[PDB]
Amino acid sequence: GASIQQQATVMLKIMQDYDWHVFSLVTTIFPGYRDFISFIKTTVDNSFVGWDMQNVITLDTSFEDAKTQVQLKKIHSSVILLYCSKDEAVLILSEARSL
Amino acid sequence: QAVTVAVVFGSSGPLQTQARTRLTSQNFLDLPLEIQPLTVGVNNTNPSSILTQICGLLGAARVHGIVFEDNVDTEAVAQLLDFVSSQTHVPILSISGGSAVVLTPKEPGSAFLQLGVSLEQQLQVLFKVLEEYDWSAFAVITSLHPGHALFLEGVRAVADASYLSWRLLDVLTLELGPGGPRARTQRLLRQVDAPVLVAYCSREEAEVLFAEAAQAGLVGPGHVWLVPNLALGSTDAPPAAFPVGLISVVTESWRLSLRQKVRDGVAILALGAHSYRRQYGTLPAPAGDCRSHPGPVSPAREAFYRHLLNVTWEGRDFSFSPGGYLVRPTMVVIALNRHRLWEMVGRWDHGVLYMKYPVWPRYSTSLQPVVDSRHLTVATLEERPFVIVESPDPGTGGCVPNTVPCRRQSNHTFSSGDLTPYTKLCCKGFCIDILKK
Amino acid sequence: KIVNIGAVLSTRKHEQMFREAVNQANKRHGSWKIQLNATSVTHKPNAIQMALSVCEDLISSQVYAILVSHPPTPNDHFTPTPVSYTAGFYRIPVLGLTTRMSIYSDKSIHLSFLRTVPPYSHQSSVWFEMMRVYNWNHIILLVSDDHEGRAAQKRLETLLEERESKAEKVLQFDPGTKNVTALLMEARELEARVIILSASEDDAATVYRAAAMLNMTGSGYVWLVGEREISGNALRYAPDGIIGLQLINGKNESAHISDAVGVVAQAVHELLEKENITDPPRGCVGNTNIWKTGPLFKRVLMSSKYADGVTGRVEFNEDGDRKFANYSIMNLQNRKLVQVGIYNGTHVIPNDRKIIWPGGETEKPRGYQMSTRLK
Ligand SMILES: *[C@@H]1O[C@H](CO)[C@@H](O[C@@H]2O[C@H](CO)[C@@H](O[C@H]3O[C@H](CO)[C@@H](O)[C@H](O)[C@@H]3O)[C@H](O)[C@H]2NC(C)=O)[C@H](O)[C@H]1NC(C)=O
Ligand SMILES: *[C@@H]1O[C@H](CO)[C@@H](O[C@@H]2O[C@H](CO)[C@@H](O)[C@H](O)[C@H]2NC(C)=O)[C@H](O)[C@H]1NC(C)=O
Ligand SMILES: *[C@@H]1O[C@H](CO)[C@@H](O[C@@H]2O[C@H](CO)[C@@H](O)[C@H](O)[C@H]2NC(C)=O)[C@H](O)[C@H]1NC(C)=O
Ligand SMILES: *[C@@H]1O[C@H](CO)[C@@H](O[C@@H]2O[C@H](CO)[C@@H](O)[C@H](O)[C@H]2NC(C)=O)[C@H](O)[C@H]1NC(C)=O
Ligand SMILES: *[C@@H]1O[C@H](CO)[C@@H](O)[C@H](O)[C@H]1NC(C)=O
Ligand SMILES: *[C@@H]1O[C@H](CO)[C@@H](O)[C@H](O)[C@H]1NC(C)=O
Ligand SMILES: *[C@@H]1O[C@H](CO)[C@@H](O)[C@H](O)[C@H]1NC(C)=O
Ligand SMILES: *[C@@H]1O[C@H](CO)[C@@H](O)[C@H](O)[C@H]1NC(C)=O
Ligand SMILES: *[C@@H]1O[C@H](CO)[C@@H](O)[C@H](O)[C@H]1NC(C)=O
């Protein structure tokens, strides 16, 4: 299998090959998000590509429907890296389609 | 030969005998020729009483004009006064209360005039404030109060006619108002992302909206509220659930007593009559009566109506637009300070806005100020190639687009009270460009 | 209990028929003891006495709603104004049955006015549909400089902007003037031939006379007007082949009375199901506060839906005017108005009657020339 670091590397390669250099990182408190964010930041910093990582949204709050809407509206990129559980992914994608 | 001017009072603590011995032989040596005031007060403001008293008053003394005062609460009184003025061709002036709120369309034969301002002028002043503090981002919140479409039209006209390309965010509407479900409107209020909000609603709707915003966390720093006179209500008694820092724009009447306003209105009528006497040898004809049917308008009435549109009293411009409201008044931007009192903040001269605070105080809780960490105070000095200081354009009062505003201090002149006009200037140059970058 | 309904009518025959209508209405809304009472007042010669009579007679009976039809005066008299103001001080809903003035659609001035007849300014919508049926894109709007002319112009311009289009020329004349020759000469040089008119009867007659004198009624032109312009003496001077509009049951006050009575009865019965219901005031003397349930009653009245009625289904738009009202399109063929189609709701259906245009032959004239000479 592949660790989360290798999946992040493949995702960054995907973003690079299609010239999506502007992106936002949206994660929950789901386990492993600390290592995911750390690896993403380390790869971005030690890179000559010129990544534009903005709006690191650690949603954290369990869909209180009060802060999450503004948190998602704070994103103005075109590529969003989402790290959360499948049910949390369903909730967040439904909220995004609402927004 | 004395111009019979009748002063009618509303129900704002009905008393006129205490204020009766101050106009019979007064305000005639000031400037007018000869006046004769007839004072009658109504303790109830229902349409039957208004019609009965005004018709009985017009049935005697050969009245020339009528001066009306209301409380603030009622709004149909303006329409009733318009109806009476159209039916009897007697000039009626509205002084204060809800009757002074401007009716944009009026009956063609009506001579009803209001010492008030349309929504367009208030929006002009509010957008001037926004430009002064560079609040280019704002959101419009309205209720289903009648005239919301007019408010939105005025906002659109002001934004298009300006030169700043304002960013108008999503427009919100309050549906239920007093019977708010606190669920749908709450969801909409929590879906906002604007630092400046312009609200249209009545007094009760204003209280409901502000209480719901306090529930939704739209109060305190980082959020500014601008409202017209409709939500203001009584200025002397600001109610609870009114956020500190609420901004409104009212004419120069909010700190004027009733006697001053009444004498001002009688002075306007007398000045119009004096101008008519100057041009036409005879005095303007008095109103006939409520009965009969004065179908058309005689040229005598029309000349009188056109001769009191342009009246200047004590240096104050009381010109009336064809829609029967003040066209070029001196406005005042008032705000609610930490002591829960409506405090004078800015003036609106001929075409210029004079503010008092260079930085808007963002009180967080009760009285406690904030610092706005992302805000800097910069001290400069005039050096010809680096910092050039000039004066703003007198016609507009603003700075040249390539410059930035800048004030100056002074020795002595204790400025804690902030009752000191700016020596406002504009700065440009190498250092200013570096600072902008 | 007893719920009072007020009415301001013209003749006692309509008072008796209003009594009959309310009596019939209260017999078809359940066997429970809910009663509808009727109070009726004739019109008064002058408006101030009319308002005083409204306050003394109607409001003193705690009327939930007031119906004001029209007086015997010809037309355009603004007679429901005192009733509207007096019953809007207390937010008592007022149902108008005959007046089509465009002022009463302003809810900032008239706070509690609903009506079962659409305003004249809505006629522009029909014109818009005609501009789609016969494919006319260049039009000349010619309106009086009043509230009505400006309202009709505003609605037509809104509809055209929805289509990404504009009127070729908007002309205004002061009401009652007799010197419209300059404006018609100005419109003569224009490329568009379809002329849309909106003015009173006398103004319509004046502009018709000027157009006939200026040879503006010949072949190739199209004259689109409303109901007012083809009524009265303006019919005598109208150029043959002029397309006009009429309202079905527009002057039938009996059907409107019955339909309004049914609407009011249903709205009252729906209102009684709610809580916090307050009795309307006897606001002759001693009362200044508004009726608390008045706004809610008006909301219920406006939101109400119907499918039965003598004049048809009634639906009130957000301004309180009747929507989905049929129109009859009439043509002046040989000095006689001949119907040539019906405006059903949002569409135009033509019958098998040939349309005769203000010139000769029945061929459809395109409403514009080329204007080969250029300035
Ligand atoms: C205004 O419109 C009214 C209704 O739309 C209309 O009244 C209608 O008049 C006819 C008779 O002339 C009635 O017809 C009824 O009579 C027959 C027997 O003759 C019976 O089988 C039925 O009862 C039949 O319906 C209509 O019922 C009647 N409608 C009502 C309810 O009034 C007036 O004549 C119109 N006024 C005008 C045109 O000025
Ligand atoms: C206020 O305005 C009125 C008219 O708007 C002025 O009255 C005009 O005066 C001139 C010359 O005195 C006459 O030729 C006009 O016929 C007058 N107009 C009318 C309608 O009568 C009046 O002089 C103005 N007053 C001031 C102080 O400016
Ligand atoms: C039914 O309607 C009649 C209309 O005349 C009512 O009579 C009026 O009643 C009101 C009070 O509701 C009084 O102010 C008027 O003086 C009465 N006028 C006349 C001519 O009687 C009658 O009381 C109503 N009955 C009800 C409510 O069932
Ligand atoms: C009033 O109407 C008359 C109708 O004859 C106008 O008379 C002529 O109008 C035409 C424009 O179509 C002008 O070219 C002529 O010069 C007019 N002749 C005259 C003045 O007798 C007249 O112009 C109209 N007056 C207005 C509109 O002010
Ligand atoms: C109200 O009207 C006049 C004073 O305006 C007075 O005669 C009358 O007694 C007053 N009544 C009340 C109840 O105030
Ligand atoms: C200059 O202004 C300061 C402000 O506090 C004052 O203390 C000082 O005395 C002034 N200088 C002179 C010369 O007046
Ligand atoms: C009207 O003018 C004359 C007849 O009066 C005629 O020759 C001409 O064709 C007609 N058309 C116009 C509008 O000139
Ligand atoms: C108008 O007539 C048409 C055609 O029958 C019909 O569909 C519609 O219900 C009518 N609308 C009314 C009564 O306004
Ligand atoms: C008649 O009116 C209805 C609603 O206004 C509309 O949907 C229908 O298409 C119309 N009928 C015709 C013939 O277009």
From TrEMBL, chain A:
Domain of life where this protein originates: Eukaryota
Subcellular location, record wording: Cell projection, Dendritic spine; Cytoplasmic vesicle membrane; Postsynaptic cell membrane
Role noted for this protein: Receptor for glutamate that functions as a ligand-gated ion channel in the central nervous system and plays an important role in excitatory synaptic transmission. L-glutamate acts as an excitatory neurotransmitter at many synapses in the central nervous system.
Family listed: Belongs to the glutamate-gated ion channel (TC 1.A.10.1) family. NR2A/GRIN2A subfamily.
Protein name: Glutamate receptor
Classification of source organism: Eukaryota, Metazoa, Chordata, Craniata, Vertebrata
Residue numbers of the full-length protein present here: 148 to 246 of 1464
